[PDB]
Write a protein that binds this DNA or RNA. Structure first.
Lengths: 180, 103, 201, 185, 73, 272
RNA sequence: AGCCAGAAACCAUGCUGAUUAAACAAUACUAUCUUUUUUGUUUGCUAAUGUAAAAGAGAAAUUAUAUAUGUACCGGUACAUAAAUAAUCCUAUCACCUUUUUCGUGAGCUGAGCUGUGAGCUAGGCAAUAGUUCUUUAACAACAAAAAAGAGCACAAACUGUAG
RNA sequence: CAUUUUUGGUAAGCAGAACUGGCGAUGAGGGAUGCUCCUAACGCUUGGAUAAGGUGCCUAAAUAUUCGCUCAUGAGAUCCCAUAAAAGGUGUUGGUUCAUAUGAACUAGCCCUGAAAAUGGAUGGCGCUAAAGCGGAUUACCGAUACCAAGCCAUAAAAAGAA
RNA sequence: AAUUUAAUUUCAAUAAAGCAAUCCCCUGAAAUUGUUUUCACUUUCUCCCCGCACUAAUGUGGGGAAAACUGGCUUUAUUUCU
């Protein structure tokens, strides 16, 4: 529906297996959940992991399932812990981060934004190894601990912007910053 | 007073330029009220009249007219492309135009 | 625009944006009187701006400064130069736009009688954070020796005090107009009076 | 980063405050002191009845925390100043030549003669509201007093800066007038 | 300006029940910004005859008001 | 490449252009500045250079080699006919500089004053200052009041009396003199009372004063670079000339770099 | 964050130029001429036309922006009031003539009376009109004719030589 | 001449090869400008919608949305492309290992130092710091003689024809 | 501006019932190859105790209770109140 705050990164549960052979009379079936912008991207990342772990390329296997995975309670805000492997210019690093968000997909988008903004790391150079809902008391980030207080009621303190129609070129008098 | 105008005001901008390139087939029109594509879309098919003043008597008169019609936007702020029956002069860039209420 | 003369009170406005908005209007078609032009804001610091003006002064010509550039010292002329930069001034179309612009430091009284407009996106408050350094264009000009400042300071104060006397008189007049309007609202025929009230009187 | 940062600033009993829109003014026995903080964008609020001031910042960063701690210290100094003037006791050191300290202009300008036997006059005028007296008790001692710790210190610094040698060794030659003791009346 | 105190976990039924209880929209209508918005809304939707009637009413008012200004001196 | 041996440039760059002045009369660039405590007084005077003489003077000069002993010195003599004030000028400060509001004139003027306006005094009917012969005294007073109220600099329009001289010229030199001292009102009272009188140099100056001297130099027409700028003369061997010019300079600028010495006007320059 | 003193450096000041500003101000005298109204401006010439922007070309708080403006006390204190700011206010469009009652302002007569002008109320029966759109001539400025009214300098030539 | 592989030579807009694509023999749109980079190869026209590429103004479209990071007393800003490194930094930002919400140690992001030249001087210029900077993302809009439909011209082929 | 019948772990009210209180839709933390079992977790503009105004606050720091309004589940009907 939305296109004003929207994230098109979604989560897909993907299942595949090795093709039956004389050597592989009974295959091994493999499942994983993967965050991607589309089904082809999800599949290609799944295939890359099948290649990295197993000996199975797209040629050597067959896809059992790919399906988008559904938010249980979208109105509820939840504490996500996310564990990364990422590449810098001069090396590879592991990192564990906390985000309070409605859903895991919002968190992954936030994570890519954070890694890009603060570390210059592109989506290609990041690998999420597990994102999951965790207890509020177990968060290490002060900015999320501050939200988790009993009484939250800060003053808003931001600029007006309106929209294109009432985005006047010139004005008779000077604007009111406080807004009250 | 004596006259009633019965059009809305506009400003004949340039032709439908792009950086260092010219298309003279389409003219760019600023309509006083508008500042959005969506609002401009209301006025989209309307007949447009460029009236201008001259030195000598032509058909006994010193006022002449070019006709065109609005037809599609040129931006999100509602600046609109108009196609005319003959090209309006660069001399008349920044001059006033009449946007009629019909059809 | 669609009006004979825009007058702009350029106090508290940020240089680049103020110039750009003025320039596009000149190009669109409009005579524009830029007023109160020492109280324009540059986003750099005083030292940083002094350095920039120093570089501008350093730029000259080896050959013959009679064919050199102009190091205009007026804050109004600084705005004018910036607008000129934002116009294709070596053309005829640009020259006509350039001629349409009028610049003045302080409030010239024939155009103080006129209404003043502002450009709301271009204020120092509007596009700069509070905790980041800035510098007033008149302050910078004074630093690099323009020094026509005290006269304007006196003139602006005298004009402002008269404007206060004008504002109180205007308030008196408006209050009296409100009082007669409210009294003579009773005398209107009921239905018509109800309609006028409905649509916001 | 943080959403909320606060400070609760105790005020002495006699202080007559007037601090609106971050233009802080404190009055007391020794004077009225005015000091803008309008470059600092924080919600100091007064409480007259139960005394104290509450300072609060919205959407703090460590820069903001530095500002809050700085302002509260600065405000406390303003209270301290009006209640009791800040006194900088400056001892005049010389290992050879008598250096003549003649206070002129009603405790406003100290005349200094004969630094390193120069046979010449250095006059060093004070800032607004900072009195320069001499000590009856200790011959070398000079009292620099006023309502503001910054102006008295600056006045003292000016006196040091005025005295100091161009080019005879800093380790060897120790002579000049220095700030010994920072007190109040 | 207005705010209604509610428990933090509440959903749509309770929000409807609370809004109906507290009648906040009436408070908004009374409020000056709300009042400017609703007056503007009427003016926006006003018909051609209604527009003339506003003109005609103001014309009657000016005639009477000017006559009162004559009266005052 | 750099010059092997260094040597200061010939003449001052700061007195380009070396060209003729556009007036015979000296031009004061700037006047004495604010001194409210001092009473109103005249700042300037025109007089005629008559010649030079020498003097014998007794010298104090403490610790000098000469010290107590007497010196012989060259000195200039300037005949100074008393200037007459004829007009009042009221100037007002603007961000565009000082601007005249109005000028107020005396109740009669000299023939010698009028001669300066006429190019053909002999063959004319001499009608200047005849509608402006008189106006109401109320008009004059209003202008004076107006000038006090709004003007912030006062100058007096003064003129020379060449009729008291042996010179061929009979045209007066007419001139503004700033008045420096107290309030504009006190100044205005001072100029009004002084007006029609004649001012000796003793009324303006005191002996022993140090004075600034404003004049156009002695002419010489268009002269060569050697004369104009003092460059080292050409070698004994040359293809052409000996007062002929040096090299002009580098290929870059691809133009004459203006700082080069050149043939042109020498003298008749304005100088302080 | 906030500040201070501090160099042959820097910018003014000073000084020189300024048909480098296609710059300008004040003053003096003068050219059947100026001013108001009417009609015109579809042999080099001898009536005479030009506008880059009329369409309601409508709108004069102010420091502001981690709060403003009044009012009351002594730049400070106390008390009100703004906070979609042009998302507002002003403002057009009751042709006519004729009957009736009121108020503003200008002019002539000897404060006042009357007339004109501007604005209203009160009563009447009185207009429009080209067969369907192809500018709605509606703006500004200039000029020619017709009436009515108002009020000499410079160059050259001789002489000069502080100049060339 | 370019990518990639590449030999000699201190290196070289140097000499010498390989594969392929260009230019040569080529307009057009972008790359601020530019024979070669990118987009893309061209009868004459009308309209559309896009590409490369853009959207603070010059200069056509957003002072768009959205999350970070960034203040520099010579910041930085689109391949080729017009400098830049080892090495430092108690500037700020994230990490990670240790110790007892503080003390250590590392780590890489930005920023700073390392970092000097010749007419006056070059992110294209003006400018920009709640960006018009740097790193992302979200759309809309603008954007070619390339792309689609239509007309007309010639060339090529095919139909079809000796009241 | 919409629209059709499918498809895909999708609701939300409506007003009567019930059910459990650190409990539950959930989510934690624990003892080849499957299980399964443990205790951890809600609200409050409710009440109490200490600190009595100690707070960013029309409150508050610490310590405890209370309930099921709030949320959650099981129902029974209801969908143009939403």
């Amino acid at each position: 529906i939305d296109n004003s705050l929207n994230t098109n990164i979604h989560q897909y549960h993907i299942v595949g297996r090795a093709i039956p052979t004389a050597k592989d009379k009974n295959p091994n079936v493999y499942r994983m959940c993967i965050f991607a912008k589309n089904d082809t991207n999800a599949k290609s990342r799944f295939w890359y992991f099948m290649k990295k772990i197993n000996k199975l390329k797209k040629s050597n296997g067959e896809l059992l399932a790919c399906e988008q995975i559904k938010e249980r309670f979208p109105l509820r805000v939840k504490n996500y812990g996310v564990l990364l492997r990422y590449d810098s210019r001069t090396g590879t690093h592991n990192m564990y981060k906390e985000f309070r968000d409605t859903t895991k997909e919002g968190a992954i988008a936030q994570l890519y934004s954070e890694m890009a903004g603060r570390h210059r790391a592109r989506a290609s150079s990041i690998n999420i190894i597990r994102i999951s809902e965790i207890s509020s008391s177990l968060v290490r980030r002060p900015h999320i601990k501050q939200l988790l207080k009993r009484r939250l009621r800060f003053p808003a303190l931001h600029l007006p912007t309106l929209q294109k129609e009432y985005r006047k070129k010139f004005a008779s008098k000077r604007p009111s910053t406080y807004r009250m | 007073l004596q006259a009633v105008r019965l059009y809305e005001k506009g400003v004949i901008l340039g032709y439908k330029r792009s950086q260092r390139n010219q298309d003279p087939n389409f003219t760019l029109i600023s309509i006083k009220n508008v500042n959005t594509k969506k609002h401009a879309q209301f006025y989209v098919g309307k007949r447009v009249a460029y009236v201008y003043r001259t030195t000598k008597h032509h058909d006994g008169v010193k006022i002449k007219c070019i006709w065109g019609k609005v037809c599609r936007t040129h931006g999100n702020s509602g600046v609109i492309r108009a196609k005319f029956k003959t090209h309006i002069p660069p001399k008349a860039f920044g001059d006033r135009v009449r946007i009629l209420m019909y059809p | 625009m669609y009006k004979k003369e825009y007058v702009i009170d350029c106090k508290g406005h940020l240089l680049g944006r103020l110039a750009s908005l003025i320039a596009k209007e000149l190009l669109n078609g409009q005579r524009i009187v830029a007023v109160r032009c020492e109280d324009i804001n540059i986003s750099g610091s005083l030292y940083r701006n002094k350095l920039k003006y120093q570089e501008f002064l350093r730029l000259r010509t080896n050959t013959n400064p009679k064919k050199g550039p102009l190091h205009l010292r007026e804050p109004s002329k600084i705005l004018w130069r910036c607008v000129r930069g934002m116009l294709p001034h070596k053309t005829y179309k640009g020259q006509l736009a350039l001629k349409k612009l009028k610049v003045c430091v302080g409030m010239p009284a024939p155009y103080d009688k006129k209404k003043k407009y502002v450009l709301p996106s271009a204020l120092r408050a509007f596009r700069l954070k509070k905790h980041r350094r800035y510098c007033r264009l008149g302050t910078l000009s004074s630093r690099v020796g323009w020094n026509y400042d005290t006269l304007v300071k006196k003139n602006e104060v005298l004009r402002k005090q008269v404007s206060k006397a004008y504002y109180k008189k205007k308030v008196n007049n408006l209050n009296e107009k409100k009082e007669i309007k409210t009294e003579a609202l009773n005398l209107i025929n009921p239905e018509q009076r109800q309609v006028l009230e409905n649509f916001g009187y | 980063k943080t959403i909320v940062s606060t400070q609760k600033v105790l005020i002495p009993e006699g202080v007559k405050v007037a601090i609106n829109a971050r233009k802080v003014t404190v009055s007391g026995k020794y004077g009225t002191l005015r000091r803008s903080f309008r470059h600092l964008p924080i919600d100091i609020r007064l409480n007259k009845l139960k005394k104290y001031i509450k300072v609060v910042m919205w959407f703090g960063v460590p820069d903001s925390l530095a500002c809050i701690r700085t302002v509260c210290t600065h405000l406390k100094n303003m209270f301290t100043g009006v209640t009791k003037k800040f006194l900088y006791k400056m001892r005049l050191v010389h290992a050879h030549f008598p250096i003549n300290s003649n206070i002129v202009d009603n405790n406003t300008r100290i005349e200094i003669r004969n630094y390193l036997g120069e046979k010449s006059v250095r006059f060093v005028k004070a800032l607004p509201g900072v009195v320069i007296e001499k000590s009856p008790n200790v011959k070398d001692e000079i009292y620099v007093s006023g309502a503001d710790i910054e102006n008295v210190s600056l006045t003292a610094a000016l006196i040091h800066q005025s005295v100091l040698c161009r080019n005879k060794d800093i380790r060897k030659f120790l002579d000049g007038i220095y700030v010994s003791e920072v007190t109040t009346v | 300006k207005e705010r209604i105190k509610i428990n933090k976990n509440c959903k749509s039924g309770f929000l409807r029940k609370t809004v109906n209880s507290t009648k906040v929209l009436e408070e908004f209508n009374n409020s000056k910004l709300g009042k400017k918005m609703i007056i503007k809304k009427k003016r926006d939707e006003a018909t051609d005859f209604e527009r003339f009637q506003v003109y005609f009413a103001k014309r009657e008012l000016k005639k009477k008001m000017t006559t009162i200004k004559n009266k005052k001196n | 490449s750099h010059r092997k041996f260094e040597r200061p440039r010939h003449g001052s760059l700061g007195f380009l252009p070396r060209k003729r002045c556009k007036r015979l009369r000296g031009k004061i660039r700037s006047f004495p500045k604010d001194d409210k405590e001092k009473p109103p007084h005249f700042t300037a005077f025109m007089g005629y250079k008559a010649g030079m003489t020498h003097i014998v003077r007794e010298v104090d000069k403490p610790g000098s080699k000469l010290h107590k002993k007497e010196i012989v010195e060259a000195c200039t003599i300037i005949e100074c006919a008393p200037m007459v004030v004829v007009g009042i000028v009221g100037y007002r400060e603007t961000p565009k500089g000082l601007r005249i509001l109005s000028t107020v004139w005396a109740n009669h003027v000299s023939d010698e004053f009028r001669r300066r306006y006429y190019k053909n005094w002999y063959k004319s009917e001499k009608k200047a200052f005849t509608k402006s012969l008189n106006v109401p005294e109320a008009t004059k007073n209003c202008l004076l009041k107006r000038i006090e109220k709004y003007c912030t600099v006062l100058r007096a329009i003064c003129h020379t009396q060449p009729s008291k001289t042996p010179l061929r010229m009979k045209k007066a030199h007419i001139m503004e003199v700033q008045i420096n001292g107290g309030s504009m009102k006190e100044k205005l009272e001072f100029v009004k009372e002084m007006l029609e009188k004649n001012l000796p140099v003793s009324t303006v100056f005191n002996p022993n004063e140090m004075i600034d001297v404003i004049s156009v130099t002695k002419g010489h027409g268009t002269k060569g670079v050697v004369s104009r700028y003092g460059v080292k003369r050409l070698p004994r061997k040359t293809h052409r000339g000996l007062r002929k010019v040096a090299c002009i300079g580098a290929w870059h600028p691809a133009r004459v770099q203006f700082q080069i010495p050149r043939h042109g006007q020498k003298g008749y320059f304005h100088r302080t």
